[PDB]
């Protein structure tokens, strides 16, 4: 099980948000902590992505771009898994020090998005998603969004995506009905990431007004990479 040995080995550890849980809840503090957590998660996602089997087959310019486009979806997917395993989808487990209950979902003004992420969390239980399926699905999520004008070397990306889909087939084989369920679950991440992309974009544009902090590396991606997705230049690869 060489492929699965690697995914398990490179799987990031626990990442905290650094949120002050002794403050009474506020919109500004909650989303500043989400933004800070997004910064910290991005660092771990880059190190995770670069250690993936066959990742440096990609063109150097494509490596960071692919991570930055998939970044939000990857965070959402892993968070849903965290939520399922830690609290049985009762709350959104963004981090040990940032667990969203229904009040915090409302307070963040992302209630609709949180509800859909809670549904995603529950689907891990309903579908009985194994830890190994999760790891392969999450790796496949990285290679599930590309620019319409094409990557620097689209062929290497296409080959790499195909290989990860093959590994998912092998994990399933031990098939058709299962592959259908998992690809449908993967597809459901993209609409959620879209809504979050739109929401964090708007928040960045009015950040100065609402007193929400955006780290340097966050402001860049949400101002440079995310608008390409929102403007239709970069689109996700849907199975169905
Ligand atoms: C930078 O990403 C933020 C975010 C976010 C942050 C950390 C994590 C984690 N872990 C997750 Cl799942 C999400 C959806 N969700 N987005 C909505 C609000 C916020 O500005 C932005």
From Swiss-Prot:
Changing residue 85 to A: In prostate cancer. Changing residue 110 to I: In PAIS and AIS. Changing residue 47 to E: In prostate cancer. Residues 1-240 are annotated as: Interaction with LPXN. Changing residue 84 to L: In PAIS and prostate cancer. Changing residue 220 to K/R: Loss of transcription activation in the presence of androgen. Ubiquitinated. Deubiquitinated by USP26. 'Lys-6' and 'Lys-27'-linked polyubiquitination by RNF6 modulates AR transcriptional activity and specificity. Phosphorylated in prostate cancer cells in response to several growth factors including EGF. Phosphorylation is induced by c-Src kinase (CSK). Phosphorylation by TNK2 enhances the DNA-binding and transcriptional activity and may be responsible for androgen-independent progression of prostate cancer. Residues 1-222 form the NR LBD domain. Changing residue 214 to L: In prostate cancer and AIS. It is found in: Nucleus; Cytoplasm. The record marks 50 as: Interaction with coactivator LXXL and FXXFY motifs. Coiled coil: none annotated. Changing residue 121 to P: In prostate cancer and AIS. Changing residue 45 to M: In prostate cancer; gain in function. Changing residue 78 to V: In prostate cancer. It comes from the Eukaryota. Binds DNA as a homodimer. Part of a ternary complex containing AR, EFCAB6/DJBP and PARK7. Interacts with HIPK3 and NR0B2 in the presence of androgen. The ligand binding domain interacts with KAT7/HBO1 in the presence of dihydrotestosterone. Interacts with EFCAB6/DJBP, PQBP1, RANBP9, RBAK, SPDEF, SRA1, TGFB1I1 and RREB1. Interacts with ZMIZ1/ZIMP10 and ZMIZ2/ZMIP7 which both enhance its transactivation activity. Interacts with SLC30A9 and RAD54L2/ARIP4. Interacts with MACROD1 (via macro domain). Steroid hormone receptors are ligand-activated transcription factors that regulate eukaryotic gene expression and affect cellular proliferation and differentiation in target tissues. Transcription factor activity is modulated by bound coactivator and corepressor proteins like ZBTB7A that recruits NCOR1 and NCOR2 to the androgen response elements/ARE on target genes, negatively regulating androgen receptor signaling and androgen-induced cell proliferation. Transcription activation is also down-regulated by NR0B2. Activated, but not phosphorylated, by HIPK3 and ZIPK/DAPK3. Composed of three domains: a modulating N-terminal domain, a DNA-binding domain and a C-terminal ligand-binding domain. In the presence of bound steroid the ligand-binding domain interacts with the N-terminal modulating domain, and thereby activates AR transcription factor activity. Agonist binding is required for dimerization and binding to target DNA. The transcription factor activity of the complex formed by ligand-activated AR and DNA is modulated by interactions with coactivator and corepressor proteins. It is linked to Androgen insensitivity syndrome: An X-linked recessive form of pseudohermaphroditism due end-organ resistance to androgen. Affected males have female external genitalia, female breast development, blind vagina, absent uterus and female adnexa, and abdominal or inguinal testes, despite a normal 46,XY karyotype. Spinal and bulbar muscular atrophy X-linked 1: An X-linked recessive form of spinal muscular atrophy. Spinal muscular atrophy refers to a group of neuromuscular disorders characterized by degeneration of the anterior horn cells of the spinal cord, leading to symmetrical muscle weakness and atrophy. SMAX1 occurs only in men. Age at onset is usually in the third to fifth decade of life, but earlier involvement has been reported. It is characterized by slowly progressive limb and bulbar muscle weakness with fasciculations, muscle atrophy, and gynecomastia. This is Androgen receptor. It comes from Homo sapiens (Human). The gene is AR. The chain holds residues 672 to 918 of 920 of the full protein.
């Amino acid at each position: 099980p060489i492929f699965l040995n690697v995914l398990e080995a490179i799987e990031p550890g626990v990442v905290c948000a650094g949120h002050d849980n002794n403050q009474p809840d506020s919109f500004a503090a909650l989303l500043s902590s989400l933004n800070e957590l997004g910064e910290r998660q991005l660092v771990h996602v880059v190190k995770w992505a670069k250690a993936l089997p066959g990742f440096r087959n990609l063109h150097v310019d494509d490596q960071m771009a692919v991570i930055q486009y998939s970044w939000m979806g990857l965070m959402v997917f892993a968070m849903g898994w965290r939520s399922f395993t830690n609290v049985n989808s009762r709350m959104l487990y963004f981090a040990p020090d940032l667990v969203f209950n229904e009040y915090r979902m409302h307070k963040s003004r992302m209630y609709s998005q949180c509800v859909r992420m809670r549904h995603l969390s529950q689907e891990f239980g309903w579908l009985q998603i194994t830890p190994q399926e999760f790891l392969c699905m999450k790796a496949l999520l990285l290679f599930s969004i590309i620019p319409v004008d094409g990557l620097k070397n689209q062929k290497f990306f296409d080959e790499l995506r195909m290989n990860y889909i093959k590994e998912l087939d092998r994990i399933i084989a031990c098939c058709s009905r299962r592959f259908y369920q998992l690809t449908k679950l993967l597809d459901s991440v993209q609409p959620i990431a879209r809504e979050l992309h739109q929401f964090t974009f708007d928040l960045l544009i009015k950040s100065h007004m609402v007193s929400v902090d955006f780290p340097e590396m966050m402001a860049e991606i949400i101002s440079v990479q995310v608008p390409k997705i929102l403007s239709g230049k970069v689109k996700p690869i849907y199975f169905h």
